[PDB]
Amino acid sequence: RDWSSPQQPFTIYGNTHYVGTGGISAVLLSSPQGHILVDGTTEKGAQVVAANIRAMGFKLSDVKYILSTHSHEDHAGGISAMQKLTGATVLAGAANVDTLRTGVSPKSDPQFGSLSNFPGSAKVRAVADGELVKLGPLAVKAHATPGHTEGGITWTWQSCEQGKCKDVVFADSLTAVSADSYRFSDHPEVVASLRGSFEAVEKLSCDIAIAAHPEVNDMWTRQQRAAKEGNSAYVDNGACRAIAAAGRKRLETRLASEKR
Numbered sequence: 001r002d003w004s005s006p007q008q009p010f011t012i013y014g015n016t017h018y019v020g021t022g023g024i025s026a027v028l029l030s031s032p033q034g035h036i037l038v039d040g041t042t043e044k045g046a047q048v049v050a051a052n053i054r055a056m057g058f059k060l061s062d063v064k065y066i067l068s069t070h071s072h073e074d075h076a077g078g079i080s081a082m083q084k085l086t087g088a089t090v091l092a093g094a095a096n097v098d099t100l101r102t103g104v105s106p107k108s109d110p111q112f113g114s115l116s117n118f119p120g121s122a123k124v125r126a127v128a129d130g131e132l133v134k135l136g137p138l139a140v141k142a143h144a145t146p147g148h149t150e151g152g153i154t155w156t157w158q159s160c161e162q163g164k165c166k167d168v169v170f171a172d173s174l175t176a177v178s179a180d181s182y183r184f185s186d187h188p189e190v191v192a193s194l195r196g197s198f199e200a201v202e203k204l205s206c207d208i209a210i211a212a213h214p215e216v217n218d219m220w221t222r223q224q225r226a227a228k229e230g231n232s233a234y235v236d237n238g239a240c241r242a243i244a245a246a247g248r249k250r251l252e253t254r255l256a257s258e259k260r
């Protein structure tokens with residue numbers, strides 16, 4: 001379950017398919033009129049995502065949008081390659097656009113000093129909080145979830161099977177992590193952003209959460225359950241509340257650790 005590792009793709013519900021690596025989520029939201037890809041995994045992982053999309057019976061040329069959660073190498077490293085293979089437009093939160101274009105995270109990022117660069121992408125455009133991305137019958141909503149990065153987006157949609165529908169959430173990372181030289185307690189905008197994001201995410205309509213790091217919502221345990229349970233194993237309408245609570249716990253632990 002390395003970030004770049006092969007992983008046999010699988011349908012989670014309706015037209016929502018996991019096409020990521022062993023260690024990093026990527027989702028294809030499919031339609032007869034074209035598809036939306038969420039995240040690219042790593043640079044090496046792009047080749048896994050591409051093969052996975054084809055294994056699910058889809059053409060790369062039919063991927064029209066690539067949606068980015070946030071601009072670190074593990075989620076976004078593969079986007080550039082996937083952009084070239086598909087012709088898609090890359091959509092991201094406003095403050096991460098420049099990072100996706102250059103592959104270099106800026107000094108506002110808590111991890112600045114400790115991050116690895118990744119390949120810059122073409123055709124990057126911004127989306128706002130609450131904005132709808134539409135493609136044929138697909139409708140994906142952008143939710144600003146800053147803190148881990150300034151331009152983090154959590155993406156939501158509905159997938160259905162014979163008219164039985166579920167609210168799906170591709171959850172951005174909400175984690176307080178930094179370089180050794182960074183003090184969260186000195187950066188009130190980042191702390192406030194994280195806290196606002198926990199609150200947004202714990203309020204989302206959230207039947208199926210797919211976390212950018214899949215183990216955050218126990219993807220592999222759930223997949224194992226699904227072998228007998230079916231795809232109800234991925235359903236848990238508390239999952240976004242739990243991802244938010246774990247974010248909050250990580251930040252509170254960190255702020256306590258920083259006290260003089």
Ligand SMILES: O=C(O)c1ccccc1S
Pocket residue numbers: 072074148173174175177212213
């Ligand atoms: O996505 C995360 O939550 C993350 C967490 C710790 C370190 C790096 C990252 S990229």
Ligand SMILES: [Zn+2]
Pocket residue numbers: 070072148173
């Ligand atoms: Zn990250």
Ligand SMILES: [Zn+2]
Pocket residue numbers: 072074075173212213
């Ligand atoms: Zn990550």
